[PDB]
Design a protein around this ligand. Structure first.
Ligand SMILES: O=C(O)[C@H]1[C@H]2CC[C@H](CC2)[C@@H]1Nc1nc(-c2c[nH]c3ncc(F)cc23)ncc1F
Length: 482
């Protein structure tokens, strides 16, 4: 039952990481935790009774209104205050790149332990001043990680002055990181200016403790100011917290104890099966599994989908289940697809007797994104699966979308998305109301209305005239305007 904690952590990290790029991360996070199982058992039942303290596991607990440890995480280190106190106060600072940052400065004298995977440390600090850091670690990278984190955490001015270049770090949701994570990211990328301008001191002789120079060389004579490396150098109060929309967890006094930027990037492999049900975890098996599941999901929920489509489309379009598919749509074009498809849907609602089940299913995931309006008459819509742009044809079949009108079996890149059931609202006349934006196809080629136009000269017609248009290769049909 150590194997549960191990697998609960793997599952919580995945879920938080997925949640934070979603539209509503707190909503997505709870949805996925109620969705998931760890070896037969509901995740949310393991979270209510398992005492494991880890960054992602605690974000989840916070989301379920549970109580978690008051320690906080910064740069992957768990800080536990061992003595002292501090007050918050807001300050503006000028970096070494003459950028202006508004920082939440802490004033007071404080002692902390910092605990990490590959190094731990004891830290003493005061207002904008590091007083002492004793760090022990597996190798020079680990020690250095700890030292960088303590240096940014001290908030000292020479750290601020050590910035080069501008700080514009964002997360995957393109949201700016708060300034302390701005500075920490900048120095995690390269720390030599920071180490060289920090300052050097002669050191006293103490058993089991050595100095460290700006190039991570050990020294029995000198050391970076206030820093020592030790050899043997090396948690139970739980409090009520608040979790806001973007999963930043706070304590009563408004300190951010945990956020998604504090989740470890390590990706281990479970020793118990983890089973995600959420649509959010479809992408686990590649964009192909996204597409199949999207269309599969629509078939299985057809009865609720068909009536929300018919009377409350706003809530249909905004559903959580359509976010994964939306990733696969080029961000440049997705809004104009959405605006194209929503109009075609509205034509099918307004012009009655022309309900097409296969067509609604095909285009429905494209209406998720915000409707930007265009006038291009898309003949196909594109989704990128592993870097290549596959196309769904607005009219007819396709490797991506292949429906079989007799067997009624829908196929998605090969795999069987299901089978459609007989629906009386299905139109029997050949009128297609959801292929051409602003136009209605009325069946086969009829020569008495003229010879075949092409699609770019449909604009030269106005207020519902009746023309034949070359829709494909050889395929000619009769199309009227609204
Ligand atoms: O801004 C916050 O509230 C966060 C972000 C910036 C550093 C910590 C981790 C992320 C900080 N969280 C917390 N800081 C502190 C905190 C105490 N003394 C400090 N001196 C400098 C500092 F910088 C933060 C602190 N206490 C509890 C926290 F929970």
């Amino acid at each position: 039952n150590d194997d549960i904690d191990q697998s609960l952590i793997i599952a919580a990290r995945n879920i938080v990481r997925r949640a934070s790029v979603s539209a509503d991360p707190l909503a997505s996070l709870l949805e996925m935790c109620h969705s998931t199982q760890i070896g037969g058992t509901r995740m949310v039942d393991i979270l209510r009774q398992n005492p494991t303290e880890e960054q992602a596991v605690d974000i989840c607990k916070a989301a379920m209104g549970l109580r978690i440890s008051s320690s906080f995480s910064f740069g992957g280190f768990t800080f536990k205050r061992t003595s002292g106190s501090s007050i918050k106060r807001e300050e503006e600072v000028l970096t070494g790149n003459l950028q202006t940052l508004k920082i939440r400065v802490h004033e007071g004298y404080e002692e902390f332990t910092m605990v990490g995977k590959r190094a731990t440390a004891i830290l003493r600090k005061a207002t904008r001043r590091l007083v002492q850091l004793i760090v022990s670690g597996r190798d020079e990278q680990s020690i250095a990680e700890a030292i960088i984190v303590a240096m940014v955490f001290s908030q000292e001015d020479c750290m601020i002055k050590a910035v080069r270049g501008d700080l514009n770090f964002v997360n995957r949701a393109n949201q700016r990181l708060n300034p302390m994570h701005q500075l920490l990211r900048h120095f995690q990328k390269d720390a030599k200016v920071l180490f060289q301008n920090w300052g050097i001191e002669h050191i006293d002789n103490v058993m089991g403790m050595v100095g460290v120079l700006p190039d991570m060389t050990p020294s029995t004579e000198m050391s970076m100011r206030g820093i020592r490396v030790s050899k043997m150098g090396v948690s139970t109060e739980r409090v009520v917290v608040s979790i806001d929309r973007f999963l930043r967890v706070r304590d009563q006094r408004g300190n951010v104890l945990l956020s998604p930027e504090e989740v470890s990037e390590t990706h281990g492999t479970e020793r118990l099966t983890i089973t995600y049900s959420s649509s959010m975890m479809w992408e686990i098996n590649g964009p192909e599994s996204v597409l199949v599941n999207t269309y599969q999901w629509i078939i299985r929920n057809w009865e609720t989908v068909k009536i929300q489509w018919s009377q409350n489309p706003t809530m249909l379009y905004n559903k959580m289940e359509f976010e994964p598919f939306q990733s696969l749509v080029p961000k440049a074009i997705r809004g104009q697809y959405s605006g194209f498809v929503r109009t075609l849907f509205q034509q099918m609602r307004d012009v009655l007797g022309t309900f097409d089940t296969t067509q609604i299913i095909k285009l429905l995931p494209f209406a998720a994104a915000p409707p930007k309006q265009s006038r291009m008459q898309f003949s196909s819509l594109t989704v990128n699966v592993r870097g290549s742009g596959m196309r769904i044809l607005v009219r007819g079949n396709s490797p991506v979308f292949n429906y079989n009108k007799t067997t009624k079996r829908l196929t998605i890149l090969g795999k069987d998305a299901g089978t459609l059931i007989e629906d009386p609202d299905e139109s029997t006349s050949g009128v297609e109301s959801a292929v051409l934006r602003g136009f209605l196809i009325l069946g086969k080629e009829d020569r008495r209305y003229g010879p075949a136009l092409s699609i770019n000269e449909l604009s030269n017609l106005a207020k519902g005239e009746k023309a034949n248009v070359l829709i494909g290769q050889g395929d000619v049909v009769l199309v009227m305007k609204r």
